[PDB]
């Protein structure tokens, strides 16, 4: 694989979004991966609706603003036959009744792929597929306060994760990093991005539950 990748320079990635006061990280991670795969398939980047996922993917196992899984969101898109654009179905930061309208569906998938639990496997996926949804342990104030540089937290878990984000690339100086898009707005971190420690024993569990949709 290449020494470095940045899918933003290829047109795969929308600007940084803000989930606000709603536990919807999973939905932003999912739309980020689906934005990237839709662009791979069609050559058109269209911002996708997280609210659609929050309101409507309960049947697949998601819990709205209380949390959920990117894989459940990918399954919903399959089961549902589509997903509405961000423009058609704007973000409210609160759970509401489902208002999906197929007329405004701009994305679809035929399931998802769970990458095996190796950073080598995740690197190959990022290099070949596009942006990848990942689970990480973000339950440390060092993550909340992150501003710049390569993020390394001594107390991070490789096994227990609590935040879904999106890997959009990786790069180098040891001190290799994953280039991660977060959903906390552009004021957090490096314009809303964070560089996470790469090839340091699966730091923060970033290769523990990586996935993307089948498109
Ligand atoms: C987002 N604002 C919050 N975090 C979550 O919803 C996270 C997202 C995923 S995860 O990426 O942590 C993960 C963890 C383990 C295995 C796979 C994945 Cl994708 C799940 N989140 C959770 O907080 C948990 C969860 C799991 C399943 C459901 Cl339906 C709800 C919640 C607790 C694991 C809300 C802060």
Swiss-Prot record:
Sequence positions that bind Zn(2+) 2 = 50, 86
Query: Which sites bind Zn(2+) 4?
Result: 92, 96
- For the ligand (Zn(2+) 6), the binding residues are 160
* Positions annotated to bind Zn(2+) 5: 137, 140
Recorded protein name is: Cathepsin L
Where do the annotations place Zn(2+) 1 binding? 9
* Residues included from the entire protein: 114 to 333 of 333
Q: Which cysteines are joined by disulfide bonds?
A: 22-65, 56-98, 156-204
TM region positions? none
Q: Which residues are glycosylated?
A: 108
């Amino acid at each position: 694989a290449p020494r470095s990748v940045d899918w933003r320079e290829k047109g795969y990635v929308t600007p940084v979004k803000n989930q606000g006061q709603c536990g919807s990280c999973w939905a932003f991670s999912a739309t980020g991966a689906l934005e990237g795969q839709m662009f791979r398939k069609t050559g058109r980047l269209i911002s996708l609706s997280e609210q659609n996922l929050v309101d409507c993917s309960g049947p697949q196992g998601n819990e709205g603003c209380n949390g959920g899984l990117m894989d459940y969101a990918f399954q919903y898109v399959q089961d549902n036959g589509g997903l509405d654009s961000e423009e058609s179905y704007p973000y409210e930061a609160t759970e509401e009744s489902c208002k999906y309208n197929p007329k405004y569906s701009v994305a679809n998938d035929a399931g998802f792929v769970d990458i095996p639990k190796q950073e080598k496997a995740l690197m190959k996926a990022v290099a070949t597929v596009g942006p990848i949804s990942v689970a990480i342990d973000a339950g440390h104030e060092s993550f909340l306060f992150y501003k710049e540089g390569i993020y390394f937290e001594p107390d991070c878990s490789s096994e227990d994760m609590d935040h879904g984000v999106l890997v959009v690339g990786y790069g180098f100086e040891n001190n290799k990093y994953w280039l991660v898009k977060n959903s906390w707005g552009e004021e957090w971190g490096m314009g809303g991005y964070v560089k996470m420690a790469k090839d340091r024993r699966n730091h923060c569990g970033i290769a523990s539950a990586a996935s993307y949709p089948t498109v």
